[PDB]
């Protein structure tokens, strides 16, 4: 009956007895460590909301950019390790702008997510170079954009693969926020309703108060392009809620 | 040999590499496969242990056809067996193209033996977990049967077995005299041996997988006809009973 | 922390303890369990301490069907009063920074109860000394000065090989890296001047059944446990290396 | 791997400045179970080794230990058969390279030097293990006549006149030195009889034509030839009389 | 069209070589004494970021030399610049000299970048 | 100090400026249509290559769109280049519009014309 | 150094926080049937069946922290007769904190009358079996009784080579050492997440005397309640 | 106890002649969701159980489209699934692009096995931890191919892998003869019944948690979403 | 190094954070027309010139930075940053922006903390300076590679305590002029270390000027009047 302490978590390629790569799950835990970021997609576009929680007032909220603008028709919200997301964001921007420069066509958000995945999975696959990709990225991206297909919201975890979702909450309040999303959603949701619900749930799952300073939100719409709400617009929306 | 059995590039104090021995014994774990090199040709026999009825007949086939003339019976891990079969196919095709005629069995045997030995040399790659019997017959070369132990030995056999019942199979084979007869009786004899070595209590069931190469099949490795396999199975069952 | 199985609190006055150690692999524990099964040493108590990670299971030494249905905690002690023989049995891995409290508690237990000689079966690393382990026999001994001189002369007559006294930080303090618990336990015993001996063996991680057989033979040669087929292996020595062959693999 | 132990890692030196992996390779050569001899006569070079065939199903013809690298250079192998065959193939490749580049036949000295360099590579790089086999090269040299060179996994390639390798190497070497000190004519028949009787007396068994295999290279015929069982039987009769 | 302006310069002491592929605006630049494609990064002016967006295509990620040179060259010129710096260590001061070296050539031959 | 051969030939109605620059590590095959770099794909032959035989060139997109069509196109375009280049890893900056067998053959013969290996 | 380690030791140690708002639980009120639920499935089955009739007033919660799981350790008593106690512990208790948890629950003054029924689930791979793990039934369960339990187990006992560690083993060892009747049920399930098959396998226990009269039958109410917790936190993208 | 020393890496052989890492990979498939694969004399139906959670969070696309006559379902890790699907798509597209012929299913499975064998042999790698149920229709006819995480693959009449798939296996083994001689609708209903028996007693086959991909004699591999599975759910008995 | 903790923490970055915590207190203030840096000093230097132990440096003329942690990696990152600044000044021919160099350093730290062949930098670069238009700047990178703009940051020995004290103290009234910013930085440093004096390594940079290492005589006289104000 002599049990010996045995651990399989150190090896990234090492399987657990039931077939679990513990390093990837630890990356998901690091994801949970990050701030909440909830994005909702509707027939009128995709809404992206995320908390710019700050440490001490000395922190400048302008520096924090949880929502980026990969392309005019592509946006992305993040939660977790921003430094990790920097490389993926640069790769996505390079792909989009290079496609526009060469083929004079707007690269589809699905293909951008694909390429980001190729970059994401490179930590495990190949990694031929000595100082090559080593660890999975500890950051999750809500690639919200509108393409020929229409409003498309994608989500990637440190696993390294994107999935097309409709309403996801990623971060510290991964669940609970998702329960609120489930309670509030339908195919008939309008953009205004989506924004209102997203900000309401942000307030519900936030420890601070909903003010334009500590919150950031954007909407990617078919007719329009990526439009990050300004301070005045954000204040108006939170006043509505 | 504790401590010295984790890498294929580590010598034990006795002076043996334990990874290769573990590969051989993992080959032992699988069901027994038997090959015979009679005067007419080479006859193969494998105890294809059926796992579930869901698998369609012919799945997990153990008798591969490297080329028209050269066949192969395998044991141990089947993935490594398939990889080695592909490698042997490539080598045989390369020789047939560059030189223009079918490869002598000795050349394929020692080339694959060198490859598996190379795998056994290095610490990074692990030794192959499969042992196979490269057997073939040629009107000029003659009936040849070579077993490729994961270690990397290329020994010509007149008859040998590989698997869990390897010892009893070898005893029965050496009781048999494998010289100067047609393969028509060798198929029956090998089926008989497979029936004896099979353990019904442990192994729930098995399927007879017989292939042969010789003058009867014009020096081509082909699965035995259904009628001949049925006759051999009937003879083996009759011999086993009482 | 000795808790009797019943309520009589059997006294271990004038007894000899047989404790294992968490050595390379499980040589000490395996040998201890092997001798327990061979000698049919009945359970007498439960040494409940806060030093090992808890574990439970049926009786390792099933023997009879009635005895099969029992409970085996991480730390249990069996004894054979016929030969004034008592034996602890460790079957658990240690909690961080808890081995030394175990050493102190067990030293106090043996001092108070009266168990005279504590035998610590263990195992050290294969390389051990500066190529001396490869040249010399793996078996060694390490007996405290308080050990009875009769046993010392018996060992001398046995013509055994003493501990190499591996060089450590001052200059030749006995070091047993494989055992781990063995060094601190020996130091605690020496401070308490409690008669005890460490019987180790230079081995490496892996299958250690032959090492356990060698160690129990060493102990038999010293104290004539059985007869200086032979040892009745426990029923616990089953499925100790695998959980069946997956059919799809082969 | 990071194998700290000296006994299970080639690179690390033993505390007494010894390479335990090389010693274990020698023990592997012993584990081969067979013994081989080689004698450099005044007219030829001989190599005699026993051919113990397990059982009878194994084809006695296929199992062999006498190999030829270059048409004038012979060889005898001792140790694991896989390692022996690998070293034989590497020696053949080296001979082919020498013939192609330099244009003339590879001298035995240079062939053993190259094999010793390969053995040094094996015993220095931690990646691979020393090949568990000892190879003895024989051949006819235009300047030194018959030449006997023994290469070993350690990287030691000194040439010999009479040498042996295997489980009975020590006793065979003792008897061979005893014979050498007499220093008789060392004729073809003389040297062959010396080698075969050395093997027979060290193994303390009677030899049969099929129980052993003999190969010889002579000045009259530089091409290496493996003596047939008929010649071995004739030589055995010669010893008998 | 693509003007393959291949040239060499005795940067410091080693005769580091250079390669140019004009295309239309996707200039390609290679650097290295030995003919090896060790690293490669593509950078071009971006309307979303002040620094031109660049990604390490292939090679060691912990180099930040090819990417930086590509960004600076893409800011100097327009469109893409496929820098392929392939110096082993070269410390870091030597890289500045190469940046000077290529700079002089662009002034000498604006067409043959 | 590298060797580059460029052949601008108008096949299938598109002026493909095939460029082939020979590096020791990776030969760069630039099949540039629209006069731009376009997608960059890396084809790395398998090191083992069975018993020193035809290898498996790992298809990997470095820049542009990930598509099995473009992967196979690069495979067929640079397979012979890698095989005749001593089993050397070869990169391809393909930027073509239409991907069909006739176009592939035309580009293949154009590269053979502009060969530097 | 040492001070930092001491701070970590506090962070890891179990702290007993009363739910009614350094005395241990059993030291405060004695119990007669203390039910322990370890794991999400065990507590889910408890809430579904046992915590269906009665007040089940919250008495305490043993909040703790570890690198694996910080969930909850709320303790309950029926409050119709406080003699019977309960515990829904979902947070994973580390090895260095299991004995601290035992001290907080019992301490050093046990009653020696409780039929400690432990509810926990293990994985099939843990089950040491002669045949392959794939041949075993998915939800099958096992039992571990103590010396003075004397009540027949509803399921076969574990085999010899098989063992159990962690908190259930801690409580069972405490009971055995101090001679407290008990039984440790192992629900070997392939799925460790919240699945109603695991609780269906846990069902046979309510039939036996252990946790017999606490459940007020009503399978329909319990069965409907089981579908309530079937909804859980969104999984990751690792498996599909 | 001893197996702990011989399971850290994939290149180590246990004293029992086993590689436990391959066993752990083979369990990784069980870690995934259940899928059912069965075929008839003219059709090959691939029925998969979408995770019974809020599909808003993630559209679990277990059934993937490979070619016009090959499609697969995911059971296990998603990264390996995506890599294998991409590889199969490359090979099929290359065949149809160069030789202008549909790639036979058996050849594709052989290539998959050869590709997945390499990680097992090489150091620092891991076997592809996903099980594929390849439902294809080449010249020979319908083919359901079981691809284990190990390179070993099986040509199967009816199969089901994933969590709690043993009940589905039992159901399939109990009705093989019916599967062989069934039409499209009956075969799909049989697969759905197998999946239902995979599901607990309380849970039933809803449109939200069921996806099916069918390839046939004149039917290209078509994935039927939640809206497109109702026709088969209708007419299927609850019992 | 490349493995995550069960909670999702990379061990290497946390160890680098601990190394930073053992470093000196790099304190900066984003004043208008003036940016002030401040780093705690271990005095000593009984036989060593202060020139070689200058923790506060100047990356070109419009950027100056201070670090907290190991000084070797700090020296190499400073060398790389100044080389990048010179290369930009050469090619682009524009004054390097504080944002630009801060992002470069953050990217370098990210690269070094990602690959397992190299360990992360065990420092936290606190970068200040003035942009082309003269806007004061204040940034602080981390071994992880997260660059964040701050109003008045403080990282090093007892980072949290000095940070919260400065947050309580930092006000636009305290940021007006430049003497007030100097008082704020000196107050934070003195709160960190009571000895003061030589331990207070002070550096100031104005809008159109270069980095001026404030002389020790100036540092102590400001301390004296700060003491006078308290009484």
Swiss-Prot record, chain A:
What is the induction comment?
Answer: Up-regulated in colon cancer cell lines. Up-regulated in fetal Down syndrome (DS) brain (at protein level). May be the target of the transcriptional activator NFE2L2.
Its chief place of residence is: cytoplasm
Q: Which residues are glycosylated?
A: 198
Q: Which region is the signal sequence?
A: none
Where in or outside the cell it occurs: the entry states: Cytoplasm; Nucleus
- Could you tell me what this protein does? Component of the 20S core proteasome complex involved in the proteolytic degradation of most intracellular proteins. This complex plays numerous essential roles within the cell by associating with different regulatory particles. Associated with two 19S regulatory particles, forms the 26S proteasome and thus participates in the ATP-dependent degradation of ubiquitinated proteins.
Subunit annotation: The 26S proteasome consists of a 20S proteasome core and two 19S regulatory subunits. The 20S proteasome core is a barrel-shaped complex made of 28 subunits that are arranged in four stacked rings. The two outer rings are each formed by seven alpha subunits, and the two inner rings are formed by seven beta subunits. The proteolytic activity is exerted by three beta-subunits PSMB5, PSMB6 and PSMB7. PSMA5 interacts directly with the PSMG1-PSMG2 heterodimer which promotes 20S proteasome assembly.
Family statement drawn from the similarity comment of this UniProt entry: Belongs to the peptidase T1A family.
Q: NCBIfam families under this entry?
A: PRK03996.1 (NF003075)
Name of the protein: Proteasome subunit alpha type-5
Its encoding gene is what?
PSMA5
Swiss-Prot record, chain C:
Query: How does the record describe the protein's post-translational processing?
Result: Degraded by the proteasome upon completion of 20S proteasome maturation.
Please tell me where this protein is predominantly located: nucleus
Residues that the record marks as modified (Phosphothreonine) are: 137
Its GO CC terms are: cytosol; nucleus; protein folding chaperone complex
Which of UniProt's keywords are assigned here? Answer: Chaperone, Nucleus, Phosphoprotein
- Domain of life according to the entry: Eukaryota
**Ion transport keyword on record:** no
Transmembrane portions of the chain: none
Q: Report the locations given in the UniProt record.
A: Nucleus
**What is the documented function of this protein?**
Chaperone protein which promotes assembly of the 20S proteasome as part of a heterodimer with PSMG1. The PSMG1-PSMG2 heterodimer binds to the PSMA5 and PSMA7 proteasome subunits, promotes assembly of the proteasome alpha subunits into the heteroheptameric alpha ring and prevents alpha ring dimerization.
- Oligomeric state and partners? Forms a heterodimer with PSMG1. The PSMG1-PSMG2 heterodimer interacts directly with the PSMA5 and PSMA7 proteasome alpha subunits.
Assigned protein family: Belongs to the PSMG2 family.
Disorder named in the UniProt entry: Proteasome-associated autoinflammatory syndrome 4: An autosomal recessive, autoinflammatory disorder characterized by panniculitis and erythematous skin lesions apparent in early infancy. Additional features include hepatosplenomegaly, lymphadenopathy, autoimmune hemolytic anemia, fever, generalized lipodystrophy, myositis, joint contractures, and mild motor and speech delay.
Protein's name in the database:
Proteasome assembly chaperone 2
Q: Which gene is the coding source of this polypeptide chain?
A: PSMG2
UniProtKB/Swiss-Prot annotation, chain E:
Write down the superkingdom of origin.
Eukaryota
Q: Which Pfam families match?
A: PAC4
Which InterPro entries does the entry link to? PAC4
Q: Which GO cellular component terms are attached?
A: cytosol; protein-containing complex
Q: Which GO terms describe its biological process?
A: proteasome assembly
GO molecular function annotations of the record:
protein-containing complex binding
Would I find Chaperone among this entry's keywords? yes
Q: Where is the signal peptide?
A: none
Keywords, comma-separated and alphabetical? Chaperone
Coiled-coil region list:
none
In the record, the note on similarity to other proteins reads:
Belongs to the PSMG4 family.
Subunit composition and interactions: Interacts with PSMG3. Associates with alpha subunits of the 20S proteasome.
Function recorded in the entry: Chaperone protein which promotes assembly of the 20S proteasome.
Could you identify this protein by its name? Proteasome assembly chaperone 4
Recorded source organism is Homo sapiens (Human)
Curated annotation (Swiss-Prot), chain I:
Expression triggers: Down-regulated by the ribozyme Rz3'X. Up-regulated in colorectal cancer tissues.
Q: Consequence of mutating residue 147 to F?
A: Displays impaired G1/S transition and S/G2 progression
Q: Which residues carry this modification: Phosphotyrosine?
A: 147
Name any GO cellular component annotation.
nucleus
Which residues does the record list as glycosylated?
Answer: 124
GO molecular function annotation? identical protein binding
What keywords is this UniProt entry annotated with? Acetylation, Cytoplasm, Glycoprotein, Host-virus interaction, Nucleus, Phosphoprotein, Proteasome
Query: How is this chain modified after translation?
Result: Phosphorylation by ABL1 or ABL2 leads to an inhibition of proteasomal activity and cell cycle transition blocks.
- The answer, when asked if Isomerase is one of the entry's keywords, is no
Q: What is its main location?
A: cytoplasm
Q: Which InterPro entries match?
A: Ntn_hydrolases_N (IPR029055), Proteasome_alpha (IPR050115), Proteasome_alpha-type (IPR023332), Proteasome_asu_N (IPR000426), Proteasome_sua/b (IPR001353)
Under SMART domains, the record lists: Proteasome_A_N (SM00948)
Task: Return any one Pfam family short name.
Answer: Proteasome_A_N
Q: Which PROSITE patterns match?
A: PROTEASOME_ALPHA_1 (PS00388), PROTEASOME_ALPHA_2 (PS51475)
In this chain, where does the modification N6-acetyllysine occur? 221
Among the GO biological process terms of this entry, one is: proteasome-mediated ubiquitin-dependent protein catabolic process
Q: Which family does it belong to?
A: Belongs to the peptidase T1A family.
Its biological purpose is as follows: Component of the 20S core proteasome complex involved in the proteolytic degradation of most intracellular proteins. This complex plays numerous essential roles within the cell by associating with different regulatory particles. Associated with two 19S regulatory particles, forms the 26S proteasome and thus participates in the ATP-dependent degradation of ubiquitinated proteins.
| Entry protein name | Proteasome subunit alpha type-7
């Amino acid at each position: 009956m002599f049990l010996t302490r045995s651990e399989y978590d150190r090896g990234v390629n090492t399987f657990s007895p039931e077939g679990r790569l513990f390093q990837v799950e630890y990356a998901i835990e690091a994801i949970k460590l990050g701030s909440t970021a909830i994005g909702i997609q509707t027939s009128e576009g995709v809404c992206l909301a995320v908390e710019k929680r700050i440490t001490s007032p000395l922190m400048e909220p302008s520096s924090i950019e949880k929502i980026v603008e990969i392309d005019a028709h592509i946006g992305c919200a993040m939660s977790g390790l921003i430094a990790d997301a920097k490389t993926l964001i640069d790769k996505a921007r390079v792909e989009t702008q290079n496609h526009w420069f060469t083929y004079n066509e707007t690269m589809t958000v699905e293909s951008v997510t694909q390429a980001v995945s190729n970059l994401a999975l490179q930590f495990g696959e190949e990694d031929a170079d000595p100082g090559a990709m080593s660890r999975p990225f500890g950051v999750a991206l809500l690639f919200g954009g509108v393409d020929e297909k229409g409003p498309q919201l994608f989500h990637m975890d440190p696993s390294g693969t994107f999935v097309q979702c409709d309403a996801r909450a990623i971060g510290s309040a991964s669940e609970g926020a998702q329960s609120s999303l489930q309670e509030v959603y339908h195919k008939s949701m309008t953009l205004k309703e989506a924004i209102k619900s997203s900000l309401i749930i942000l307030k519900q799952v936030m420890e601070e108060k909903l003010n334009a300073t500590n919150i950031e939100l954007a909407t990617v719409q078919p007719g329009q392009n990526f439009h990050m709400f300004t301070k005045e617009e954000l204040e108006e929306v939170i006043k509505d809620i | 040999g504790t401590g010295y059995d984790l890498s294929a590039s580590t010598f034990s104090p006795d002076g043996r590499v334990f990874q290769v021995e573990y590969a051989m014994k993992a080959v032992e774990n699988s069901s027994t496969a038997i090959g015979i090199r009679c005067k007419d040709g080479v006859v193969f026999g494998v105890e294809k242990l059926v796992l579930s009825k869901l698998y369609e007949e012919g799945s997990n086939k153990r008798l591969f056809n490297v080329d028209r003339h050269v066949g192969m019976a395998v044991a141990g891990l089947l993935a490594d067996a398939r990889s080695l079969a592909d490698i042997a196919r490539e080598e045989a095709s390369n020789f047939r193209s560059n030189f223009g005629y079918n490869i002598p069995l000795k050349h394929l045997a020692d080339r694959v033996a060198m490859y598996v030995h190379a795998y056994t040399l290095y610490s990074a790659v692990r030794p192959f977990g499969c042992s196979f019997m490269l057997g073939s017959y040629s009107v000029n070369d003659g009936a040849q049967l070579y077993m490729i132990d994961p270690s990397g030995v290329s020994y010509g056999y007149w008859g040998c077995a590989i698997g869990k019942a390897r010892q009893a199979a070898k005893t029965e084979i050496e009781k048999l005299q494998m010289k100067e007869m047609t393969c028509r009786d060798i198929v029956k004899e090998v089926a008989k041996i497979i029936y004896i070595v099979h353990d019904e209590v442990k192994d729930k069931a098995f399927e007879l997988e017989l292939s042969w190469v010789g003058e009867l099949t014009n020096g081509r490795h082909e699965i035995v006809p259904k009628d001949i396999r049925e006759e051999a199975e009937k003879y083996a069952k009759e011999s086993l009973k009482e | 922390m000795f808790v009797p199985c019943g309520e009589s609190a059997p006294d271990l006055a004038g007894f000899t303890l047989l404790m294992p150690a968490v050595s390379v692999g499980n040589v000490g524990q395996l040998a201890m369990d092997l001798i327990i099964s061979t000698l049919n040493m009945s359970k007498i108590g439960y040494f409940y301490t806060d030093c090992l990670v808890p574990m439970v299971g049926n009786n390792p030494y099933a023997t009879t069907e009635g005895n099969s249905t029992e409970l085996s905690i991480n730390a249990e002690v069996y004894s054979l009063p016929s030969r004034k023989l008592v034996a602890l049995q460790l079957r658990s891995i240690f909690i961080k920074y808890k081995s030394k409290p175990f050493c102190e508690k067990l030293l106090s237990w043996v001092k108070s109860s009266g168990c005279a000689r504590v035998i610590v079966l263990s195992s050290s690393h294969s390389y051990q000394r500066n190529d001396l382990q490869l040249r010399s026999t793996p078996f060694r001994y390490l007996l405290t000065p308080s050990m009875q001189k009769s046993v010392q002369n018996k060992i001398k007559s046995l013509n055994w090989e003493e501990m190499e006294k591996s060089r450590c930080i001052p200059e030749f303090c006995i070091r047993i890296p494989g055992g781990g618990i063995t060094k601190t336990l020996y130091d605690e015993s020496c401070s308490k001047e409690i008669q005890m001996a460490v019987l180790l063996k230079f081995v490496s991680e892996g299958d250690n059944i032959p090492d356990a057989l060698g160690l129990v033979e060493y102990l038999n040669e010293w104290l004539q446990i059985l007869k200086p087929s032979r040892w009745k292996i426990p029923s616990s020595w089953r499925l100790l290396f695998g959980s069946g062959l997956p059919p799809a693999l082969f | 791997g990071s194998s700290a132990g000296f006994d299970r890692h080639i690179t690390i030196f033993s505390p007494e400045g010894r390479l335990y992996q090389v010693e274990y390779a020698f023990k592997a050569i012993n584990q081969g179970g067979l013994t081989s001899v080689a004698v450099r006569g005044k007219d030829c070079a001989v190599i005699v080794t026993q051919k113990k065939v397990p059982d009878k199903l194994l084809d006695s013809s296929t199992v062999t230990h006498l190999f030829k690298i270059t048409e004038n250079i012979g060889c005898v192998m001792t140790g694991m058969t896989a390692d022996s065959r690998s070293q034989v193939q590497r020696a053949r490749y080296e001979a082919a390279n020498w013939k192609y580049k330099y244009g003339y036949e590879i001298p035995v000295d240079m062939l053993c030097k190259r094999i010793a360099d390969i053995s040094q590579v094996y015993t220095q790089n931690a990646e691979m293990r020393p090949l568990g086999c000892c190879m003895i090269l024989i051949g006819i040299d235009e300047e030194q006549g018959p030449q006997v060179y023994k290469c070993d996994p350690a990287g030691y390639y000194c040439g010999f006149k009479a040498t042996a390798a295997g489980v009975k190497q020590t006793e065979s070497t003792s008897f061979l030195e005893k014979k050498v000190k007499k220093k008789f004519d060392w004729t073809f028949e003389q040297t062959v009889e010396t080698a075969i009787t050395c093997l027979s007396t060290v193994l303390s068994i009677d030899f049969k034509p099929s129980e052993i295999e003999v190969g010889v290279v002579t000045v009259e015929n530089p091409k290496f030839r493996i003596l047939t069982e008929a010649e071995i039987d004739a030589h055995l009769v010669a010893l008998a009389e | 069209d693509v003007s393959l302006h291949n040239f060499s310069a005795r940067l410091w002491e080693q005769l580091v070589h250079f390669h140019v592929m004009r295309l239309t605006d996707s200039l390609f630049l290679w650097v290295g004494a030995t003919p090896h494609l060790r690293n490669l990064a593509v950078a071009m002016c971006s309307r979303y970021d002040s620094i031109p967006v660049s990604t390490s295509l292939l090679g060691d990620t912990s180099d930040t030399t090819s990417t930086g040179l590509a960004q600076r060259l893409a800011r100097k010129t327009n469109k893409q610049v496929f820098v392929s710096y392939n110096l082993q260590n070269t410390d870091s001061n030597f890289a500045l000299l190469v940046e000077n070296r290529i700079k002089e050539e662009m002034e000498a031959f604006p067409e043959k970048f | 100090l590298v060797i580059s051969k460029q052949k601008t030939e108008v096949v299938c109605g598109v002026p493909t400026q095939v460029v082939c620059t020979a590096f020791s590590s990776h030969i760069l095959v630039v099949v540039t249509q629209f006069g731009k770099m376009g997608t960059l794909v890396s084809l790395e032959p398998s090191s083992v290559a069975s018993d020193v035989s035809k290898p498996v060139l790992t298809t990997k997109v470095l820049l542009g769109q990930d598509e099995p069509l473009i992967h196979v196109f690069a495979k067929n375009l640079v397979a012979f280049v890698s095989q005749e280049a001593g089993n050397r890893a070869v990169l391809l900056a393909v930027a073509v519009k239409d991907k069909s067998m006739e176009g592939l053959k035309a580009l293949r013969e154009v590269i053979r014309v502009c060969q530097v290996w | 150094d040492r001070e930092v380690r001491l701070q970590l030791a506090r962070k890891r140690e179990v702290r007993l926080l009363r739910r009614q708002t350094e005395v241990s639980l059993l030291e405060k009120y004695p119990c007669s049937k203390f039910i322990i639920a370890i794991g999400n499935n065990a507590v889910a089955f408890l809430s579904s069946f046992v915590m269906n009739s009665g007040v089940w007033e919250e008495v305490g919660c043993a909040k703790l922290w570890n690198e694996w799981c910080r969930a909850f350790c709320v303790f309950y008593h029926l409050k119709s007769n406080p003699s019977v106690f309960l515990c829904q512990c979902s947070c994973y208790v580390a090895e260095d904190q299991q004995y601290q948890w035992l001290e907080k629950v019992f301490g050093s003054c046990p009653r020696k009358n409780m039929q400690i029924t432990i509810l926990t689930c293990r994985h099939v791979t843990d089950y040491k079996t002669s045949e392959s793990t794939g041949s075993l039934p998915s939800p099958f369960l096992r039992a571990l009784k103590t010396q003075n339990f004397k009540d027949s187990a509803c399921c076969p006992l574990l085999e010899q080579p098989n063992i159990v560690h962690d908190l259930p083993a801690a409580v069972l060892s405490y009971c055995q050492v101090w001679k407290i009747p008990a039984i440790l049920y192992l629900c070997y399930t392939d799925v460790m997440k919240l699945d109603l098959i695991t609780v269906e396998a846990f069902k046979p226990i309510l039939s036996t005397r252990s946790l017999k009269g606490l459940v007020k039958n009503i399978p329909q109410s319990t069965e409907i309640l089981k579908k309530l917790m079937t909804t859980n936190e969104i999984q990751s993208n690792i498996y599909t | 106890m001893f197996r702990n020393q011989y399971d850290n890496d994939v290149t180590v052989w246990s004293p029992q002649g086993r590689i436990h890492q391959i066993e752990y990979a083979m369990e990784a498939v069980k870690q995934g969701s259940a899928t059912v694969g069965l075929k008839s004399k003219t059709h090959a139906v691939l029925v998969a159980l979408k995770r019974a959670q809020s599909e808003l969070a993630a559209h679990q696309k277990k059934i993937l489209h490979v070619d016009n006559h090959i499609g697969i379902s995911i059971a296990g890790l998603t990264a390996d699934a995506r890599l294998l699907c991409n590889f199969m798509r490359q090979e099929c597209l290359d065949s149809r692009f160069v030789f202008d012929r549909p790639l036979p299913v058996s050849r594709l499975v052989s290539l998959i096995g050869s590709k997945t064998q390499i990680p097992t042999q090489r150091y620092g790698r891991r076997p592809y931890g996903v099980g594929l149920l390849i439902a294809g229709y080449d010249d020979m006819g319908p083919h359901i191919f079981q691809t284990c995480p190990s390179a070993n693959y099986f040509d199967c009449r009816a199969m089901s892998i994933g969590a709690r798939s043993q009940s589905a296996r039992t159901y399939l083994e109990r009705h093989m003869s019916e599967f062989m001689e069934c039409n499209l609708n009956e075969l799909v209903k049989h697969g759905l019944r197998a999946l239902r028996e995979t599901l607990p007693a309380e849970q039933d086959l809803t449109t939200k948690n069921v996806s099916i991909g069918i390839v046939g004699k004149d039917l290209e591999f078509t994935i039927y979403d939640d809206d497109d599975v109702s026709p088969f759910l209708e007419g299927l008995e609850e019992r | 190094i490349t493995v995550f903790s069960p909670d999702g923490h990379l061990f290497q970055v946390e160890y680098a954070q601990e190394a930073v915590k053992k470093g000196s207190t790099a304190v900066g203030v984003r004043g208008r027309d003036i940016v002030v840096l401040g780093v705690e000093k271990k005095s000593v230097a009984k036989l060593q010139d202060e020139r070689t132990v200058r923790k506060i440096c100047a990356l070109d003329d419009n950027v100056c930075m201070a670090f907290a942690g190991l000084t070797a990696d700090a020296r190499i990152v400073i060398n790389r940053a100044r080389v990048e600044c010179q290369s930009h000044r050469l090619t682009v021919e524009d004054p390097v922006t504080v944002e630009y160099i801060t992002r470069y350093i953050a990217s370098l730290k990210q690269r070094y903390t990602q690959s397992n062949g190299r360990r992360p930098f065990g420092i936290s670069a606190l970068i200040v300076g003035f942009d082309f238009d003269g806007t004061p700047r204040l940034y602080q990178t981390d071994p992880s590679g997260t660059y964040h703009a701050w109003k008045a940051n403080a990282i090093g020995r007892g980072a949290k305590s000095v940070r919260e004290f400065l947050e309580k103290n930092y006000t636009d009234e305290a940021i007006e002029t430049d003497d007030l910013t100097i008082k704020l930085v000196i107050k934070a440093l003195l709160e960190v270390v009571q000895s003061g004096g030589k331990n207070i390594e002070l550096a100031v940079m104005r809008r159109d000027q270069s980095l001026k290492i404030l002389n020790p005589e100036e540092i102590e006289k400001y301390v004296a009047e700060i003491e006078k104000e308290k009484e």
